């Protein structure tokens, strides 16, 4: 699986236990040193962002290589696998450990390994079940917003409604004398004022109750493990169902199956097959991240509190009202039942191997895998809707097929020469292939609910053009590694690899990589008689690795269709082309030290790494005068340097008690070395960041000083200039030359985590914490809720009432008619400490199952996920983001009770 | 085991080896021009003038342009693979049109030099195609020079940025990074392309969808009027003004029927192809219209002032077509110029508000001729054409001396984005803070002061170069003092 001198972190099955999410990488936030995992949505159909030893490139992806049982997969396919089938998870964060897997092995690989049946004479059955709820985890951002009449008085005073207008003249006949809108619709012209009050100036509408809910979560599973004299099997079926926390629907529901099987046919051949399948239903809330008027957390913060989405009985209405609108705005349940969507995906993973051992020593091994998924989605827009722009309805069907095949063949030969010189050779071949496909077809113009096939729409100007997409790639690799070992205390590993990809041109597709590593067992040679210490191994490595994750057709100079008339065709220039595109080459030096004391009762590991990346694939931004947005190129280089260290112990006292703890830490320092055009620095436009030589990608902002107490204007520091009294010079006119690079970082430098666990006679309690410090984020929601210049129709912060006037002069918030800039007062400290899980179990005593041979195990749980976070970021979530906090889906706080009957 | 993958639906980029390749690439060039010279790209320079005031519907989309928010306008807009909009999108689309026109012209010249065409009809057609490509190059370079280079009247600029044009790239080269050209080089390039392409194109028009000699004359007259040469503008405007007659209508209903029809309008010299499935777009930025069953309902984010409403007489045909009294269903006026065309609907009685792209009309040629006649002292041809144009549109003007021209050009070319250029070259300040809003729209369309006062000769009448240039090109001299 990996070398002996490598950097391997193995996570056991108990940390991959029942977790009530489909995103399995979020269960590893804080369990591996160096590997940092951050997810950006509480969406059930969300996929985590993993980075091992910092970011390695700027254009290509820095995701690891996810491998489930030899053949390599993607995280969406892993999301349809039952997590109760996984035996362990090895993370190989080295250049000598990742030397037989290569497609993006410079980012590290993640080896998921599935469970196999133990070989007892009586098989094992296990029935798991669970049920829980999920809620929003933060409410503090809407604790300092305005109320209804307070916002109306603030708007009337600031001159938004009129130049000479009062509160009653605005609230009476301008935006409450808009029964003129509700009197145009037959469904609700007799409900205004009777059971439907859309504008209510006396209460405050709870907009959090109208946009977010409490969502259930269920899972069930049943597994049969067994094994006779030669064969072994693990079969399993189960289902998972998670509902969306937000009122805009986004669920996840899968029915799974798994059959791992292994057998020894004779004394010469051993065969095996581990094959799985799934039927899955996804849906995503695709409005989070954009700023629409009444949607998301931006909608729970900014909607005025004198607009009522509820009826008189407390239920959610079908429509609400915003002033100036020409049709009523639909709420999220009505918009969900008038725009249906349904997906259905069928996934199958077939995977098999055969080992042949002809002579003593060498074993040949052949392995082949197929990964097929057929997805089929449907969308509607329902006819005869009164609050729509048309009485006609539309429909759209889509069919996806993604097929990925793989073949891999090794031949290992191990031997000794005299007594203590054990060599091992390994040569091998690897071929990966992929071919995807998308077909789509829509229709529109339907007038009935029942008559809505695609062949029943209008046939004139209501026709449209279908959809078709094709993608494909391939990889071919030849590798060989050699392990030499002395008697007990010296191991030396040497490996060569040739990689060829389909993503690069025919003269640049092949690259050669190598790795040399070593391990020295100091305890078994020098200090073999000791009182306290019990293990000491030193290990070091150096190897070069490639990265080839850009896109499939990024090196051709292409010409596409662009039709002008309907009589002839027309061609346009599509891309620019780069004939000299090739791999990105990362050389990593590693040096570690792994101790151990009190015979297992203190383990400590310390690592050091460099990881220099050359010929870095940047999607370089061409100037706008070329007519192209960007183009992939091999220009630039960027360094890292880091330490990471973990230590675990056991501090129990009595026979009954069992107390253990673990701690885990990583720090690194990014550094860019060469950009792309002879440039010293490059600022990414309206993102807030900058790439500079000798620094990480820092933030690039103006510095906010305060306000001017004599006139009320905002003030910014002039960079570089110092006044005569030592103070820094300010100015009140904004310009783009007031911006400078500030000493923050987009990628956080310090990650870590720590775990505690106590036990008793049965009753056990485990608590896991994760933390990230050094993380800053631009709070983009505070641009909208803390400005008096524009967007006065929305709800504002409560601090915009002590604004600078001619009477109120000693204050801190500026005058009204000013737009704010994106400067250092919108940059916030998003450094958090979470409580990831708090599982409390109680395995039932073995004396309870005495005469009955039908049962023989039972456990219960009381699990709470994300129930505590400590940070100083005021934006519903510090983890859900990365460079900005837009209209975001916050994470979930979940309470789950389960049961397990093992019999 | 060979592994090389070529895309499905993409063809390689080859030099032209036949005539069908040349004709296909010319049609692709015209379809690229359709998405560039839109009314949706000239709404920003229309809102920046002194005609409009923001309503309470506006979600800070148009308000940087109306109220002159110079903190947003320094790096406004974006041009990336999910959105091309704003100042940056404007600067990107015309550079893309210039580059693909360069590729078409240079490959057709090399194909004419290498003799890959069989007979002489293909050589005559290829030379006419080359002339059309040169006209598209000149239009792209002029429309970039209009917004990103200073006038002769600006007071305070960046140090050494008053006599500079734009980055002039004459060949297809997607890796070129250079400095800005002088204004003399850019204007000599534009006028050289137009004067070299006029001689090849035939006199009569072949189609309204493609470039003719009338469009080259009309574009040259517009460029000469924007420069300041009135004799040459009156010379080039006379070759086309007597070929396209005005709309013959009796009341405003026939004017709205003939005007909104792209096919039955006898004034359009050049327009792009459009049908209900290809080449149509929705232009509801200024009027805010939305279909509701078989009616249209409006909710604009900006409405004109009271002097723009008071410009039009009540008997004018344009007071129900160009602007319309449909705010609050009967109470106020909006700019209703790009509403719809009734031939691009899906169902023939349900609006979808889809229009097409018009590139030049005859009313602008009339106004250029009257302006160049009143500035060179030839008064009978200034009183003939202005009285003919104002009588054909319903309300005839009485006295023709340089104040009826400004009012008639403001009345005719509303919505098209040609008022900022006028108030620069006619020396008019803003006075946004002194104008009166409409009295019927009280509570909906109120006043908001300018965030930056813009007197005569202010630097912010000329936009700033985007931030992707002057970060990738440190040789570029920027425009603004800030």
């Amino acid at each position: 699986l990996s070398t002996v001198s490598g950097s391997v972190a193995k996570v056991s099955s108990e940390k991959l236990a029942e977790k009530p999410v489909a995103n399995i990488m979020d269960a590893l936030q804080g369990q591996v040193a160096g590997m940092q995992v951050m997810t950006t949505s509480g969406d059930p159909t969300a996929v985590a962002s993993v980075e091992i030893h910092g970011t390695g490139s700027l254009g290509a992806s820095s995701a690891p290589l996810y491998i489930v049982d030899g053949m390599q997969t993607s995280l969406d396919v892993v999301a349809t696998m039952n997590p109760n089938d996984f035996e362990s998870m090895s993370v190989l964060k080295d250049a000598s450990a990742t030397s037989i897997y290569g497609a993006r092995a410079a980012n590290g690989v993640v080896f998921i390994q599935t469970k196999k049946g133990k070989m007892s004479e009586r098989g094992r059955i296990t029935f798991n079940a669970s049920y829980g709820i999920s809620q929003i985890l933060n409410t503090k951002p809407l604790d300092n917003m305005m109320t209804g009449d307070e916002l109306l008085d603030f708007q009337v005073k600031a001159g938004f409604w009129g130049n000479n207008q009062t509160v009653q003249k605005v609230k009476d006949m301008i935006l409450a004398g808009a029964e003129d809108l509700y009197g145009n619709y037959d469904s609700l012209k007799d409900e205004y004022g009777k059971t439907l009050f859309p504008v209510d100036f006396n209460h405050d509408a709870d907009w959090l109750k109208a946009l977010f809910k409490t969502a259930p979560t269920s899972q069930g599973d049943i597994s049969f493990s067994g094994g006779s004299q030669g064969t072994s099997y693990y079969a399993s079926i189960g289902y998972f169902d998670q509902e969306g926390m937000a009122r805009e629907p986004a669920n996840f529901k899968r029915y799974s199956g798994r059959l791992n099987f292994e057998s020894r046919i004779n004394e010469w051949l051993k065969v095996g097959a581990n094959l799985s399948g799934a039927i899955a239903n996804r849906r995503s809330a695709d409005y989070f991240g954009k700023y629409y008027m009444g949607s998301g957390t931006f909608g729970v913060l900014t909607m005025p509190r004198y607009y009522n989405p509820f009826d008189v009985n407390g239920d959610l209405a079908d429509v609400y009202y915003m002033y100036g609108a020409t049709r009523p705005s639909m709420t999220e349940p009505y918009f969900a039942k008038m725009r249906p969507f349904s997906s259905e995906s069928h996934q199958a993973n077939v995977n098999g191997f055969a080992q042949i051992t002809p002579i003593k020593g060498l074993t040949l091994k052949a392995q082949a895998g197929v990964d097929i998924t057929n997805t089929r989605t449907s969308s509607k827009r329902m006819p005869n809707n009164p609050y729509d722009s048309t009485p006609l309805g539309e429909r759209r069907e889509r069919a996806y097929r993604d097929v990925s095949k793989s073949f891999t063949n090794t031949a290992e030969y191990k031997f000794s020469i005299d007594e203590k010189h054990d060599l091992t050779a390994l040569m091998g071949h690897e071929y990966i292939e992929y071919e995807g496909d998308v077909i789509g077809a829509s229709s529109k113009g339907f007038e009935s609910d029942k008559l809505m096939l695609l062949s029943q729409g209008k046939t004139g100007n209501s026709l449209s053009l279908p959809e078709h997409r094709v993608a494909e790639y391939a990889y071919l690799s030849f590798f060989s590694r050699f392990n030499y070992g002395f008697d007990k205390w010296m191991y030396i590993d040497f490996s060569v690899r040739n990689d060829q990809s389909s993503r690069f041109g025919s003269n640049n597709r092949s690259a050669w990589f190598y790795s040399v590593g070593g391990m020295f067992d100091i305890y078994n040679k020098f200090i073999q008689e000791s009182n306290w210490l019990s293990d000491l191994r030193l290990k070091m490595s150096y190897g070069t690795t490639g990265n080839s994750e850009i896109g499939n057709y990024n090196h051709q100079a292409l010409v596409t269709v662009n039709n002008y008339t309907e009589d002839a065709m027309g061609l346009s220039i599509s891309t620019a082309g780069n004939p000299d595109l090739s791999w990105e080459k990362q050389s990593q030096f590693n040096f570690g030290l792994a101790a151990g004391a009190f015979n297992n009762r203190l383990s400590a590991e310390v690592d050091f790494y460099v990881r220099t990346t050359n010929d870095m694939l940047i999607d370089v931004p061409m100037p706008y005068i070329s007519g192209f947005f960007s183009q992939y190129q091999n220009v630039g280089s960027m360094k890292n340097t880091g330490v990471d260290l973990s230590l675990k112990g056991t501090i129990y006292q009595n026979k009954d008690w069992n107390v253990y703890a673990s701690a885990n830490f990583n720090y690194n320092r990014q550094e860019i070395t060469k950009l792309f055009f002879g440039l010293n620095k490059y600022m990414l436009p309206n993102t807030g960041t900058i790439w500079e030589i000798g620094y990480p990608n820092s933030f690039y902002m103006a510095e906010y000083a305060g306000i001017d107490k004599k006139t009320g204007k905002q003030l910014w520091y002039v960079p570089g200039q110092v006044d005569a009294d030592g103070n820094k010079v300010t100015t009140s006119q904004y310009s783009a030359d007031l911006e400078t690079r500030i000493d923050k970082s987009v990628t956080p430098p310090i990650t870590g985590g720590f775990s505690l666990g106590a036990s008793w006679k049965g009753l056990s309690l485990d608590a896991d914490f994760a933390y990230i410090v050094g993380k800053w984020m631009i709070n983009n929601d505070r641009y909208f809720t803390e400005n008096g210049g524009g967007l006065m129709q929305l709800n504002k912060d409560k601090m915009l009432l002590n604004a600078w006037t001619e009477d109120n002069k000693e204050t801190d918030v500026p005058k009204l008619g000013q737009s704010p800039q994106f400067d250092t007062h919108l940059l916030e400290n998003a450094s958090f400490l979470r409580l990831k899980n708090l599982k409390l179990t109680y395995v039932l005593p073995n004396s309870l199952f005495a005469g009955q041979n039908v049962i023989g195990g039972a456990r219960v749980y009381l699990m709470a996920r994300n129930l505590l976070t400590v940070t100083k970021y005021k934006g519903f979530d510090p983890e859900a983001g990365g460079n900005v906090g837009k209209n975001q889906y916050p994470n979930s706080k979940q309470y789950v009770a389960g049961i397990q009957l093992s019999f | 085991c060979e592994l090389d993958r070529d895309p499905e639906g993409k063809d390689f980029q080859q030099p032209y080896t036949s005539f069908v390749q040349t004709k296909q690439n010319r049609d692709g060039l015209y379809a690229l021009l359709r998405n560039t010279e839109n009314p949706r790209m000239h709404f920003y320079q229309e809102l920046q003038s002194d005609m409009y005031c923001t309503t309470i519907t506006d979600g800070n989309s148009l308000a940087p342009f109306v109220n002159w928010d110079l903190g947003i306008l320094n790096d406004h807009g974006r041009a990336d693979e999910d959105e091309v909009s704003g100042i940056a999108g404007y600067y990107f689309v015309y550079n893309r049109l210039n580059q693909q026109a360069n590729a078409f012209v240079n490959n057709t010249e090399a194909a004419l030099q290498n003799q890959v065409y069989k007979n002489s009809t293909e050589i005559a057609n290829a030379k006419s195609f080359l002339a059309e490509g040169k006209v598209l190059q000149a239009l792209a370079i002029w429309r970039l020079m209009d917004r990103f280079s200073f006038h002769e009247s600006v007071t305070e600029v960046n140090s050494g940025a008053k006599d500079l044009g734009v980055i002039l790239l004459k060949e297809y080269n997607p890796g070129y990074i250079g400095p800005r050209a002088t204004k003399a080089q850019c204007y000599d390039y534009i006028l050289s392309r137009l004067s070299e392409a006029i001689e090849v194109l035939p006199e009569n028009r072949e189609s309204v969808l493609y470039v003719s000699r009338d469009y080259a004359y009309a574009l040259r007259a517009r460029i000469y009027l924007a420069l300041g040469e009135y004799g040459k503008a009156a010379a080039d405007a006379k070759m086309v003004v007597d070929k396209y007659p005005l709309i013959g209508a009796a009341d405003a209903s026939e004017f709205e029927n003939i005007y909104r029809s792209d096919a039955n309008n006898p004034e359009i010299i050049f327009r792009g192809f459009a049908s209900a499935t290809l080449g149509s777009f929705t232009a509801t930025t200024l009027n805010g219209a939305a279909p509701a069953g078989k009616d249209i309902k409006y909710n604009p984010s900006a409405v004109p002032f009271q002097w723009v409403v008071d410009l039009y007489e009540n008997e004018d045909f344009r007071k129900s077509v160009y602007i319309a009294k449909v705010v609050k269903k009967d109470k106020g006026y909006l700019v209703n110029k790009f509403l719809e065309d009734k031939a691009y609907r899906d169902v023939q009685d349900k609006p979808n508000l889809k229009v097409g792209a018009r590139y030049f009309s005859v009313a602008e040629v009339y106004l250029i001729l009257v302006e160049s006649a009143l500035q060179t002292g030839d008064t009978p041809t200034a009183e003939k054409y202005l009285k003919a144009l104002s009588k054909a549109r319903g309300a005839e003007v009485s006295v023709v001396n340089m104040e009826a021209l400004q009012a008639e050009r403001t009345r005719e070319l509303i919505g098209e984005g040609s008022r900022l250029r006028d108030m620069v070259r006619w020396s008019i300040p803003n006075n946004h803070d002194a104008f009166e809003t409409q009295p019927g729209l009280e509570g909906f369309a109120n006043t908001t002061p300018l965030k930056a006062q813009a007197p005569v000769g202010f630097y912010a009448y000329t936009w700033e170069f985007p931030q992707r240039d002057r970060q990738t090109n440190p040789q570029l001299i920027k425009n603004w003092p800030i």
Binding site: M293, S295, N686, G688, T689 | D80
Partner: peptide, 13 residues
């Protein structure tokens, strides 16, 4: 939703 409110910053990483 409808009437997208503006002046947002783009997100790299």
């Amino acid at each position: 939703g409808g009437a997208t409110t503006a002046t947002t910053t783009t997100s790299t990483s």
